[PDB]
């Protein structure tokens, strides 16, 4: 119980590659958030790693920019929003960095 102490719900993260081994954060703040936004922590490591790189984002920061990400390995981000009460819900995503191909270079 605790007189509530519930929490925000989960913010809406997207994530999108677009550079070799770097993959664009971009997410937004919560609607179920009871107060306002102060900030959120990020949390992203290897899907066999067991220690989350945790991170922490100005409500300010609504996006991240991750370069040198590991090509064909599968990588999980979390976040989470932080209102005047802490921290509450946290987002799942689930992404694969794209993988060498070393075609061929006919010409």
């Given at each position: 119980?605790?007189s509530?102490?519930?929490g925000?719900?989960?913010?809406?993260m997207?994530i999108?590659t677009?550079?070799?081994?770097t993959?664009?954060?971009?997410?937004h703040?919560?609607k179920?958030?009871?107060g306002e936004?102060l900030?959120?922590?990020?949390?992203?490591?290897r899907a066999?790693?067991a220690?989350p790189?945790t991170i922490?984002?100005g409500k300010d920061?609504q996006?991240?920019t991750?370069?040198?990400?590991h090509?064909?390995?599968?990588?999980?981000?979390?976040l989470a929003?932080?209102n005047?009460?802490?921290?509450?819900e946290?987002?799942?995503?689930?992404i694969?960095?794209?993988?060498?191909?070393?075609?061929?270079?006919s010409?």
């Open positions: 119980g605790s509530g102490s519930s925000p719900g989960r913010p809406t997207m999108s677009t550079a070799m081994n993959a664009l954060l971009q997410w703040p919560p179920e958030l009871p936004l900030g959120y922590r990020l949390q992203y490591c066999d790693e220690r790189n922490d984002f920061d996006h991240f991750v370069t040198g990400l090509k064909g390995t599968t990588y999980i981000f979390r929003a932080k005047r009460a802490g921290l509450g946290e987002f799942e995503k689930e694969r960095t794209p993988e060498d191909l070393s075609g061929p270079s010409g």
